[PDB]
Design a protein around this nucleic acid. Structure first.
Ligand SMILES: Nc1ccn([C@H]2CC[C@@H](COP(=O)(O)OP(=O)(O)OP(=O)(O)O)O2)c(=O)n1
Ligand SMILES: [Mg+2]
Ligand SMILES: [Mg+2]
Ligand code: NA
Length: 351
DNA sequence: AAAAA
DNA sequence: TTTTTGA
DNA sequence: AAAAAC
């Protein structure tokens, strides 16, 4: 029998999850450990959830868990409890916990992460209305946008919306850089029907250093002139060819997506979170691999490179510590081949 | 929390 | 037992 | 001067 690897980068994980009863519970337990800053226990529940997502059959008895890695005693007790009556008492207790409920609610606001959510909870806040109306609190520009466009941003992006955004991004980019290669990355590249945002990788084989640097500024100025730019933060590249977010130039946006552009009213438009990444042409395969995800697939790719191959992988490069050389790649397939891994298709990276 | 060193 | 867990 | 954004 074929042995399931402990690494997500050695598993094929499509969106057809036969174990959602177990993985929904494990994702909740992981999220609680993330909040309680218990990184180790968090990661163990994330890995167990990931491996169950790869299974081609549903777990219906404890015998079905034999030989599956990342399922220790604690995880097997959770699976046993769900087999017993269809529910997880552990995940149910987390769903009813006040700290957990407040963290989920507060971090659902764009611009609010773990530190600000924890701060507001310890101050005694429990609702978004009481936070917004408070006269002592001061909000960042990101949080102001997060509250103003809250319902649109919490409703998530569907495929017709992602496709409409892709058309807008591609059309704007090729207007200013005709030879640019625009790729939608993230969940939508992995075949997802929904996402919290729409991510893109932009690269150009012939653009100069100045042209490459100016593209995101030209495209966002163009949208600003049209009143489509609801939020914009451009992070300049800190990329160093000879060697936390990656160092490529990027922008975190909120775009006004007119309903007439969506082929699938109210105010007639929807606020959409969009991320654009510009990378030098020679790093395009590393950037594409890093931005395609999933987060668990990326973690395990890097963990496999370190522990199994004595290599160092990131969104910009692959370094071989034994040969003392950087390994170049023109495609994701070439990165997988450098690592000694069978190629995993993007729609198989939903770890 | 699980697996490796 | 202690170390590692993605950059 | 942290925090947030992946
Ligand atoms: N902690 C993280 C977060 C993100 N990423 C990478 C892989 C995914 C990519 C996009 O980030 P998200 O937009 O948050 O990921 P997603 O897969 O697109 O999921 P969603 O469908 O919710 O946008 O960046 C990662 O490696 N590690
Ligand atoms: Mg995304
Ligand atoms: Mg993103
Ligand atoms: Na948030």
């Amino acid at each position: 029998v074929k042995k399931i690897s402990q690494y997500a980068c050695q598993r094929r994980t499509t969106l057809n999850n036969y174990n959602q009863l177990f993985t929904d519970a494990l994702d909740i337990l992981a999220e609680n450990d993330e909040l309680r800053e218990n990184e180790g226990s968090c990661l163990a529940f994330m890995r167990a959830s990931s491996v169950l997502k790869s299974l081609p059959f549903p777990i219906t008895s404890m015998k079905d868990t034999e030989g599956i890695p990342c399922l220790g005693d604690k995880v097997k007790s959770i699976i046993e409890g769900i087999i017993e009556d269809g529910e997880s008492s552990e995940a149910k207790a987390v769903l009813n916990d006040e700290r957990y409920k407040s963290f989920k609610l507060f971090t659902s606001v764009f611009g609010v992460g773990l530190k600000t959510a924890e701060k507001w909870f310890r101050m005694g806040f429990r609702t978004l209305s009481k936070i917004q109306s408070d006269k002592s609190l001061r909000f960042t520009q990101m949080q102001k946008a997060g509250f103003l466009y809250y319902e649109d941003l919490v409703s998530c992006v569907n495929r017709p919306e992602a496709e409409a955004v892709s058309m807008l991004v591609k059309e704007a980019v090729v207007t200013f850089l005709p030879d640019a290669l625009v790729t939608m990355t993230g969940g939508f590249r992995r075949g997802k029907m929904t996402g919290h945002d729409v991510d893109f990788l932009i690269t150009s084989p012939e653009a100069t250093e100045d042209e490459e640097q100016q593209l995101l500024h030209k495209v966002t100025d163009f949208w600003k002139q049209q009143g489509l730019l609801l939020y914009c933060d451009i992070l300049e590249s800190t990329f160093e060819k000879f060697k936390a977010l990656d160092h490529f130039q990027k922008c975190f946006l909120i775009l006004k997506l007119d309903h007439g552009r969506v082929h699938s009213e109210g105010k007639g438009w929807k606020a959409i979170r969009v991320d654009l990444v510009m990378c030098p042409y020679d790093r395009r395969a590393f950037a594409l691999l890093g931005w395609t995800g999933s987060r668990q697939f990326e973690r395990d790719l890097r963990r496999y490179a370190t522990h199994e191959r004595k290599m160092m992988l990131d969104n910009h490069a692959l370094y071989d510590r034994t040969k003392r050389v950087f390994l170049e790649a023109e495609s994701e397939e070439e990165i997988f081949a450098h690592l000694g891994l069978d190629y995993i298709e993007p729609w198989e990276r939903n770890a």
